[PDB]
Amino acid sequence: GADNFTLLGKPLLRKELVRVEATVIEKTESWPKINMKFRKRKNFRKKKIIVNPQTILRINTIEIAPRL
Amino acid sequence: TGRGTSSRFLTSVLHNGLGRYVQQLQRLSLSLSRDAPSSRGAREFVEREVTDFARRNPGVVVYVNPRPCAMPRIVAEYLNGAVREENVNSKSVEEIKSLVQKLADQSGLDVIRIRKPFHTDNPSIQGQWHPFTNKRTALHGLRPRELR
Amino acid sequence: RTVSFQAKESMIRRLEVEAENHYWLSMPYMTAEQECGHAAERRAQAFEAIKAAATSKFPKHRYIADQLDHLNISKKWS
Amino acid sequence: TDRYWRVQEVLKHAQHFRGRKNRCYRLAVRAVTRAFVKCTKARRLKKRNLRTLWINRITAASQEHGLKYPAFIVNLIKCQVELNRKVLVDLAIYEPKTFKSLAALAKRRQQEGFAAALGDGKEPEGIFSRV
Amino acid sequence: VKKGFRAAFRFQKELERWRLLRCPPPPVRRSEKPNWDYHAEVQAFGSRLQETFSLDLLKTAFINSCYIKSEEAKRQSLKDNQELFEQGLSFSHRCLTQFLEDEFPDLPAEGTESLVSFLTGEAVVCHVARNLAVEQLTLSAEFPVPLPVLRQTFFAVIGALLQSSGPERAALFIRDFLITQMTGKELFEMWTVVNPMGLLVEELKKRNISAPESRLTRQSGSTTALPLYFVGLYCDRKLIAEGPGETVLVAEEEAARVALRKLYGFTENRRPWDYSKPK
Amino acid sequence: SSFSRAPQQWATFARMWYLLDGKMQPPGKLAVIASNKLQGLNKPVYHQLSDCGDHVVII
Amino acid sequence: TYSSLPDDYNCQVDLALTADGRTIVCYHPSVDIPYEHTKPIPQPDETHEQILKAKLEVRKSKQLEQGPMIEQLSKVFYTTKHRWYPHGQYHNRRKKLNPPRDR
Amino acid sequence: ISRKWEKKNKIVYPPQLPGEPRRPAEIYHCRRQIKYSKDKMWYLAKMIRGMSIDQALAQLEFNDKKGAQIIKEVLLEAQDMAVRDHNVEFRSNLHIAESTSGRGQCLKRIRYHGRGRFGIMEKVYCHYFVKLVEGPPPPPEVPKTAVDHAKDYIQQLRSRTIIHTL
RNA sequence: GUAAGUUUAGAUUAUAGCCAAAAGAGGGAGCUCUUCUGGAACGGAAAAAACCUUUAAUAGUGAAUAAUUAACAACA
């Protein structure tokens, strides 16, 4: 999108028209998530934690050209 | 648990990657014992992999202090002020190497639930919708039912 | 319980799809005679592997290194 | 000799409870487990609820332009547009001018779609209906 | 009496945890605390920034007048950072002003001064330095380091950096680390503008443009306790800027603010500043 | 666009007043429309907890 | 009149397929309200705070009682009286001291 | 048994620096063993909270409960030490900052009955805690007016942040 | 189409359902039995152990779908 105009892919724009670049900032994981399945006599020790990985990206530049 | 736990929004320390990426970890402290089964993996790590990590990352201050110690411990300090301690009790060389690499990649930012995975300082470009949007005007700005 | 219009259409679609299955099953490419023995070689080979795998159970070997490696637990700084 | 820490483990999760439940280990333990299960169950429904919210906002925005929600989605699909519902809400909120242009495309395709139905298929595909 | 030494030791740790929460220790600088090497940290500090610093000059920049007094007081019972401080502050003012002018040539000199002052404010400098661990590397006789002393070192380090790496590297450092702080900062947030209507007219007469005629474009809930008024400034019967407000005065004031941004090319949709340039 | 934060919030969250004529009009159809306007469902950013309902006047 | 939507309220919409046909381009220049369709500023020559104070007038028995005060507050804001009633200490302390704010 | 209330009177502050306001005096007084119910005594404590030394004493003089007489005696003892030991210049310049009662060690006996029944007899004892701050009682709170309520409500509405949005 | 099966030796545990739906027999309602088939949602039928859609369970602010309490006076 631009100030007064926009471009829509069908379903994607040509690679020449648009180039987008970003940078990786951090590699991290997810804060613990609690999983507990339902069962009779649940007990307190039937617990599992999920700490799946994570990563951070920072947008750097968006480039377009008059290649219509 | 979420009701009983805190949360934050997406944020960056000081826009680290805008100009150049800076490593948050600044100082590493290692305690070892000459004779201890718990430190065996750490003992071998110093022999082989400690040098490689230092060469790979020369900007982090590493302190290695072999001493009579019950449980070897690793302390990591970050630029933002975060300090993290990890026990090396009876951990293998491979486990130690992975942990240090993870510590270097991690930032001092708090690890809690993030409400929004997206942060933008200019969410709107064409203007935020308001009720007057798409409302047709009238000649002379006549309000409804105005006889004039 | 009066039947909803949506339910009737769904049942009709299932019947129509099944009708197409009937047609494509109405033209057997190979006759009965051709089918006989066409896969005999493959089936015989497969069973031989099954028999070999099934009858391969036995107790596992023991190695000196396992006993000797335990002594390494006492390694320390020089 | 560590039974105190076992009680503390339950207590830390039950500090925010109210009444004798928060201070009775018999009751606190039961509540802690129920809370954990409730959070686990909420994970599945939370995603579904968010999708419902996105659809509702799109319908309100679409109706303001005079376009029904099913028509907008179908026309966009016919236009080979693969924007997700969450992004569709985002464009309307922060890009009203773009959304109006998007509405025109859906409306224009709808007009061509109506013409195609009236045409009965004899007529060639419309300029905006070309794939 | 429960027997055992491990259990008794465990309770001692429990007591310590409660004691720490009840009575947090007084803050102390990392320099006094053990396992601190100034030389190693400076080398790591320079390497982390990917910048070349003259160790002697950098130490002088970190050295402060207050720090010397403590050493002299201890001595009774060394080069200041003033020279380096002036270079960084003076150079930064020119360089910071240069950044503002290039993007916004139309913006008046007075506005640039407000922007430069805000970007060079003690709080702004203090926030960057503290988050950069500069406080730990700062040499002073008091902890937490006083802000004016901290600000002196920040520009003093810039002066040392200029000698070590030249203006070009420092300018990129300033752009990468200081100009970044203006992201998300609106013009009037960083510049205090009173009487926008008068200022807007003053600019227009300079451009030989007629003063706009205010009109009420839209109104809602006028007689309610939550009224919304939209006021558009019409110049030569042409709307130049419109702003929302709760009262006509507020709406007119808000509309004037929008025009000032447009006059200086500070539109919200304006092209973002570039940190990409390696040159 | 380019408006200040607080005025933009005020305008977006402002409540509107609507007038309805009931002469020879079925209340049920009017009620359905009235519910949409009263609850604030007529806004693109409608939220359950935003208290975005609007005033409806029926004559 | 190629555009299928009115261009008179929000912005002019110009829809155009690209020559290659791989892209759809929308041009949306904003439209300003006509001068003739706007009202002038009030010609006759008061702060909202004064109006708010006047609305909650103190007339009877000097300061009115809590109930009437709530009713007067409720009438102004078209709210129920139940909303205005205070709450006990237990919940008041529970309120988070430092709520996060983003954008 | 714990006697931390007395230790609060043994706290010694560091010497005040020249740039420091004159520290107001704080006096803690308690009676550990009273043959009185804490619950009944609490009623007296709750009412007197925040009142002046003279006003509380005047009310106690005309009170019918036995506990009230004890409270006045406790108040007088605290006042005497305040001037004697805490360098209080004006006796009248005192107010009741805090007043509360606690449970004390009791005695257990069996309650006989004429028809062969028995009951649980208890001799109740209680503790009483009061903290006195030099100076007049703080001014009373002023209830919020309608205008104040409306302003906060508008402020609260503005403070609202959009939930679950981009 | 597919991968288990037979024999030899040692050895126990389980051996009491529930409801739905078919086939019979007592019977004449409904019941009382005998035989075959199926079931144990976090979806749906209003709440719904027994009916319908559903191969296990993992994180994600994605997507296509299944079942799915509703239905549209008479004379030549």
From TrEMBL, chain B:
Keywords: Mitochondrion, Ribonucleoprotein, Ribosomal protein, Transit peptide. It is found in: Mitochondrion. Coiled coil: none annotated. Pfam families: L51_S25_CI-B8. Gene3D superfamilies: Glutaredoxin. GO terms for molecular function: structural constituent of ribosome. It comes from the Eukaryota. Residues 34-107 form the Ribosomal protein/NADH dehydrogenase domain. Its main location: mitochondrion. GO terms for biological process: mitochondrial translation. GO terms for cellular component: mitochondrial inner membrane; mitochondrial large ribosomal subunit. Belongs to the mitochondrion-specific ribosomal protein mL43 family. This is Large ribosomal subunit protein mL43.
